[PDB]
Write a protein that binds this DNA or RNA. Structure first.
Lengths: 129, 135, 150, 84
RNA sequence: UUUUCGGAACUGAGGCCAUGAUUAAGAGGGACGGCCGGGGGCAUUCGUAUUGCGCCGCUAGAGGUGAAAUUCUUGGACCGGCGCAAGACGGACCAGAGCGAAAGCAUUUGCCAAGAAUGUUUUCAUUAAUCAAGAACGAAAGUCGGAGGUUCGAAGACGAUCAGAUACCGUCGUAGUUCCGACCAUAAACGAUGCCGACUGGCGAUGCGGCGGCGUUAUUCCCAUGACCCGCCGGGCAGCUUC
RNA sequence: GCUGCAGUUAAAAAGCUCGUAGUUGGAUCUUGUGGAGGGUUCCCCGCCCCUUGCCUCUCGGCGCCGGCCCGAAGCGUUUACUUUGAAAAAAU
């Protein structure tokens, strides 16, 4: 089956970081997972990552540090309209000061902090902190 | 016993399991012998038993668990008898008896590849048999 | 895993990354085609065809010495069958079961297994028939099973 | 696991002794072979897991035998891969 | 009057397109190969015991219980020997072993159809997952109609034990227990633990398939494939170990 | 108990499987450079092939010197989503 790919992905890197690891193997490589981890890399929670290529769908390998505490998925994907936002981020984050809800908009995939400056609502995907 | 179609198909189905781990490996020869001694008709031929006769002296080959060995002299003499009989059938006669159509009777093996190196499947045998004598 | 058994298992074929020729080989695209057409005359069906090439002839597969699959080559001629062999082999099995079931009415195990193989036909049929590969009026019954396998 | 092990670059056969679809790239565990025994003086090419009887055009008419995996050849050498 | 122009409709042969197919899921279906199992159906074969019967031999007690008695017995039991018949049943071997969706499944041999796992550089190309409606199977007991009825045995009749004893215990014994054809749909039908998928420790075993190997071992004298030893890869029943 | 519950033993997974509706479902079809707004690359015109995809034109203005150029007219296969407008009785 593997109904939702992204939802199975994050639990590995969540589990792996707890035990004390710094290399993982996540499959089967969706484009959606790439742009997620790109945003998550900029802020600094993970390091550079290598995309292995296969014809089947690829495999991805990540280098990570203890800075991450947990990245979760939120499924199914609800809408946000920039007044629903404040209610979401209260429940899902440890603090106002830091933590980053991610979402996708027509202006691309980004954190919530950026979307507020573009006046774009959209569909929420996950979170991390 | 009935027009060379059941017959031919059972030919097929006996020359199929030819190889595998379940062979019996000597009562395929036997069963080729049980489509000949119970092959007692007419025109049709003397005629087309020749080729079966190949295949079946080829039973009189393949029994043998491999290429390094040497061939119980009774087996050797049975081989001979076969080949010798399959000179009989193939002087007397001349039609060439895995092809060259006539009037018909009674084939089809134009339709597989060429009458002819299955015609040339008598030299093969005899060279093989030279080599077996050599062994 | 399995769709009418509880089991789970791996035995799937695994292809190399490469896909050249590779170098060592012969029988240009065209040579492979006439090599195939002869086999389909003899009743060798597309699955059997690729096997008998792969085992004893120089091909790795007939998808890297041609730009098409084994089946599409046969289909372009018009010499393809009117139903897929996959569907045929399901129907082929279930008739013998029904014969054994008439000869023995106390083989409840066979009766059980028939329900599976029966329902597996109907599911497969609902793939093809929506895709316009079968008539949208064709159904599976005892009578139509008898005639279509012969 | 020592819980720090590399996975980018594996050992030549101490981390490529694994199942073929649990490797980083999927490889077959099969090969071809160029033969040419005497029973049939011709340069034949045959797949390792024959699955079917391979015939001979010489005095012999059998070369292989399909078992439960690889294929048991015969009294004829003829061996190569080549390369794959 | 006639062309022309415009719009519309339909037919042939020919140029120009890089002239048009994403991969094959550590998803599923299907083919192919060699195997595996108290899986199922049908037919067939065998063993000992138990009970009954006949015959032979010896003579007084035999059954049974905590202790007894009912009961059995010189037309003779029990006991020993020999043969025959009937029905029932597959011991020891038989295991934190195997197969089946579950209920369940052990004497021989053959036939009939079915299935898992593994192997594969074969085929199809998303055909999937879970499920109201609806459907198949479903222990034992019970019901209806036939066959059979050794053994055990609800009910029932006796003998004891007990203040009482409709019981536990002993003797006898009907239905039932067995087979064939219809019904019945329930169980502590219990791992008291939904099904499908992903990720996350260590270690030694066992059943099946495949692959790799210093060697002993079988035979025909010698790499057919057998047994034993060591290691590796799948999926399966389980175990041990821990901040 | 949607946010936000529980079902080995405390109340509790249909005996078991098949199966339509319903719900849910893998991977894959575009990136860099000058000017402008903000850093030291990165986010309104354009450029490599594309750039609000096209034409065809003709009627009514803008041009420049009969001739030529560019706005408005059909639209990019269809929806959900999101963002901006319009339109929303009072009292509360």
């Amino acid at each position: 089956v593997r109904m939702n790919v992204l939802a199975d992905a994050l639990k590995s890197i969540n589990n792996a970081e707890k035990r004390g690891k710094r290399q993982v193997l996540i499959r089967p490589c969706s484009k959606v997972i790439v742009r997620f981890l790109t945003v998550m890399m900029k802020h600094g929670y993970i390091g550079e990552f290598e995309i292995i290529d296969d014809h089947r769908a690829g495999k991805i390998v990540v280098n990570l540090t203890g800075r991450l505490n947990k990245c979760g998925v939120i499924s199914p994907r609800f809408d946000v309209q920039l007044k629903d936002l404040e209610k979401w981020q209260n429940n899902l984050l440890p603090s106002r000061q830091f933590g980053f809800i991610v979402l996708t908009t027509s202006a691309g995939i980004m954190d919530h902090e950026e979307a507020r400056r573009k006046h774009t609502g959209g569909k929420i995907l996950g979170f991390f902190f | 016993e009935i027009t060379h179609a059941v017959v031919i198909k059972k030919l097929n189905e006996i020359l199929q399991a030819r190889g595998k781990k379940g062979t019996d490996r000597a009562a395929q020869i036997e069963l080729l012998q049980l489509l000949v001694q119970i092959a007692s008709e007419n025109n049709l031929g003397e005629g087309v038993i020749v080729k079966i006769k190949f295949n079946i002296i080829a039973s009189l080959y393949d029994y043998n668990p491999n290429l390094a060995t040497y061939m119980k002299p009774e087996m050797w003499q049975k081989c001979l008898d076969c080949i010798n009989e399959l000179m009989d059938i193939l002087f007397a006669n001349p039609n060439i008896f895995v092809g060259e159509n006539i009037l018909e009777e009674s084939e089809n093996l134009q339709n597989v590849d060429q009458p002819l190196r299955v015609r040339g499947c008598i030299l093969t045998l005899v060279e093989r048999m030279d080599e077996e004598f050599t062994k | 895993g399995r769709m009418h058994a509880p089991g789970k298992g791996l035995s799937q074929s695994a292809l190399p990354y490469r896909r050249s020729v590779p170098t060592w080989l012969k029988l240009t695209s065209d040579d492979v085609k006439e090599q195939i057409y002869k086999l389909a005359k003899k009743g060798l069906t597309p699955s059997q065809i690729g096997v008998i090439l792969r085992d004893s002839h120089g091909v790795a597969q007939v998808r890297f010495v041609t730009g098409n699959k084994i089946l599409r080559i046969l289909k372009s001629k018009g010499l393809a069958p009117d139903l897929p062999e996959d569907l045929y082999h399901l129907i082929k099995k279930a008739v013998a079961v029904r014969k054994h079931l008439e000869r023995n009415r106390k083989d409840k195990d066979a009766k059980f297994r028939l329900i599976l193989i029966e329902s597996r036909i109907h599911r497969l049929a609902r793939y093809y028939k929506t895709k316009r590969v079968l008539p949208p009026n064709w159904k599976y019954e005892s009578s139509t099973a008898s005639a279509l396998v012969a | 696991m020592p819980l720090a092990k590399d996975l980018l670059h594996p050992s030549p056969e101490e981390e490529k002794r694994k199942h073929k679809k649990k490797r980083l790239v999927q490889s077959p565990n099969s090969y071809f072979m160029d033969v040419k025994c005497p029973g049939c003086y011709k340069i034949t090419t045959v797949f390792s897991h024959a699955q079917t009887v391979v015939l001979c055009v010489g005095c012999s008419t059998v070369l292989c035998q399909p078992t439960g995996g690889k294929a048991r050849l015969t009294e004829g050498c003829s061996f190569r891969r080549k390369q794959h």
